[model samples]
Target: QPVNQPILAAARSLHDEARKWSSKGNDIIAAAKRMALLMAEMSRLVRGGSGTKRALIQCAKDIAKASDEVTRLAKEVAKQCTDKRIRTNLLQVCERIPTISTQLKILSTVKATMLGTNISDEESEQATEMLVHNAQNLMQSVKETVREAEAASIKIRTDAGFTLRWVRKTPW
Candidate 1:
């Protein structure tokens, strides 16, 4: 038979709200992956174009901004959480975001020069290939960040020391 509604409702409400923020962190990480893929594709397309050097720069800049926002939000949400493992993993992921952004910026600059007003298809193709490779590696790191965020959310529930028995209190 099913249990009573009021008995289960309050605890369920708390868990639901807390998990929502955790899921939000995962969503931000997913957005980061999209940005990474866009960067890789933008680098490829820019190589094949002429007099469009600024677009490559713009893509890198936009990606860096998005990454910064994702890392910042993740850090804030992680801090409010009480799980030790979750805190540790999220902090580690936060550390990687700036590094990835910096690397992308550097690669964008290199790509700009290599594809700059050049007259050879071979050079553009080679430069685009290198950019794609770098983007893939960076995107992998971002994927790890997403995985870590999800793991942190799980840890919050599985090992947070929160208990239902303690939620009920008796008058002395």
Candidate 2:
């Protein structure tokens, strides 16, 4: 179920393995050598998780790399494929995979620019609370920082104390 499986699994495996030997005080160098190999595999996965690229660049590059030769490779697969009907399915799918790349480029950018504001209906209730909480917190932060606003313009500022009587217009 974990989409974060690669490093998560590897590090967990290494920890158990290392503790198994390390607590014994009698581990193998041959084991150490193999562990080093897996540890490197684990290390790379950890570094990759720290990244922020988003699904955009890497997948786009892979789609760029994959679909071009994917069509070519499917041809060989189509040759060994038994039925012309089944192979034709493969053939047709691969035939214009180039269009998939074009449409993917179009759709990805369209999703990027156009879908930037799109949201799920699930956000309706939770988002209202989050929006209001942020609005209140933002005003809380700005309100305290507005010492300059004491001498500047705010309806509350002038009538707060000194000009209250002027605004009240008592019979004087």
Candidate 3:
């Protein structure tokens, strides 16, 4: 299982981008960076030949969980922050998480299909191919999301002074 170069590159880039931003006490940037690192690790696991189906599923689950945390924290950051551009970017990254989760679900389905006993030979091959395709898409989507989030965070920290005017209540 050779590594997907594009996916690897994107994930690595996002991870590097996430590391550059820091806040005094805010966990939003930290959470976002952790999410990015998780995705990078996930991609590495998927690319490596050592991971089993169960391992991949677990990775997806972990990433989804992290994405949820990032989304929640990002929304908080967006609401209290006065910068509209940064807010919009934060929201955009939040939006991309669910999309990544969906992609992961598709990957799960592909794996299940591959593992199922009822599928014909052609169907099995199709499932395998789809799994590969979806994996690529997942990595690409995650990469793009991280890029957007990093750009926004960078702006918030550098250009906007990372200002937070008030701490709004977390809307359910």
Candidate 4:
């Protein structure tokens, strides 16, 4: 015997919705990863004035913009979540976005200051070096956070599938 039509229908809908968002979230993570790579490369290039200060600052600004979008998207994915574990992981990823954005802001500030005056090459290089180190750390954190979030997404999808199966088996 099958369970109530409405119950099974709702379960299937929820499962399908979550699956769609999970896929979307994974795509967002991939984009974020690419942006992070750009940021990291810019950070390295900015060091020792190897690259234009303006270019690095622009890169940082662009990254900050993308971070905001990525964070918002992650939050939306969390909203579609029914599982506490998955939502928590998604929130964790969101939490790190602000920090990365802040780092980029700081990088931009350093570059702006360097560009404003003849801020001795030695001093500018030192500041750039510090920013490079911070960017590297930020990139690592971003990648790790993405990995955790993806794992959580996978768990959610797997559990949802299992539950759907149980729903189909439930005879009422």
Candidate 5:
């Protein structure tokens, strides 16, 4: 499994744009970069290595901690900024934190939703095997659609997302 490149890309953008102005963007991007690096390492430790459960939890927790800091910095910089470009850029980077954290959480906690079956590591392997089989069936079921998309060279189009800011905007 590949690491979450979207996380890296957002952090990369933050770092790149931070060079133009300063402050504050620098701090947020720094947090983002740190979080991104941990995310990659955590992905590797979880999917690419035989890392322990504790290690995975540690990585995810640290990433989430850094993610929180990134949001804090992003909010501070994104608001009350004179430059719209920088403000928007910071907002854009901040927007992706949820996806990044959710991906980390799910990546670390595969089969978590299917609890009560945590018998042993073999069960974990079985859960992964089940996941793979289901994924294979899905892909196999859509060969025509897959081929069509392949022929059309489909790029990532998962930009739209769900946000819970309505709670902030709601009026009773």
Candidate 6:
């Protein structure tokens, strides 16, 4: 799988760039979550040990990298948001991104070590299974985080249109 595998590479690009347009895109949150899900699944696929573990570890690394982007985006949104409720909600999501990112790093270390020569099959298998299970959990959390952002994005979109309509009706 390697860190630079085509699919993982593509996901990394999306995850990295999502930060730039965080507050402006129509589907930014969903798109970011999609990258998270892909990274997790890619890690799951690399559970067979050998070179696969390294590849999966790279996948795990990308997930955290993407998470960092999420954190940055949230911070940017926090500073820009004027509405109290929206600010609070965006901040909440921002806070969670780093927490899951910590878990992603932990998973990467554990998965990478399973590739070590001294590990027994039973131990490796059990650890890999647990990691995959936890990765699934992390992916679910990312999805929920995205949903929260989407709520705010929707409000911004709707509010803009509403203000424009009012302006046109009362123009000089």
Q: Which segments of model 1 are wrong by more than 4 Å?
A: 1-30, 33-37, 117-130, 155-172
The TM-score that candidate 1 achieves is: 0.60
Reference-based TM-score of each model: 0.60, 0.31, 0.60, 0.60, 0.45, 0.60
lDDT string for model 6 (1-172, tens) is 3342433444444454434333334334534755656673674455344666667667767777766765665555545445678768778766776776677678667767776567788877676566655555555545545555544544453223311000111223
Q: Which candidate has the top score in TM-score? A: 1
Which portions of model 4 show Cα errors greater than 4 Å?
1-26, 48-51, 115-122, 155-172
Clashes of each: 0, 0, 0, 0, 0, 0
Q: How far is candidate 4 from the true structure (C-alpha RMSD, Å)?
A: 16.1
Clashing pairs in 4: none
How close is each model in CA RMSD to the real structure? 15.1, 32.5, 8.1, 16.1, 15.3, 9.1
Model 3 lDDT per residue over 92-143, tens place: 7667667767676667546543542566878765655555555455445444
Which is the better candidate, 2 or 4, if ranked by lDDT?
4
Question: For candidate 5, what is the TM-score?
Answer: 0.45
Provide the lowest-lDDT 10-residue window in model 1: 161-170
Backbone clashes counted, model 1: 0
* 1-172: candidate 4 lDDT, tens digit per residue: 3222332232233233223333332555444644645564553445434336667677777767766766765665565566788788778767777786787678667765675554687887677566655655555555554455455454444233211110112234
Runs of candidate 6 with Cα error greater than 4 angstroms are 1-27, 30-34, 40-44, 120-122, 155-172
Name model 5 segments beyond 4 Å from true.
1-25, 48-51, 83-89, 111-172
lDDT, each prediction: 0.56, 0.35, 0.56, 0.55, 0.45, 0.56
Tens digits of lDDT, candidate 1, 9-69:
3223323323333233244644554464555446454535546677777777777786776
Query: What tens-digit string does per-residue lDDT give for candidate 2 at 1-172?
Result: 2122432343344334333223121112122224334333422322332232244333433443444543454454455544555555556555654554555444333233322235664553343233223223322222221221111212232122221111211243
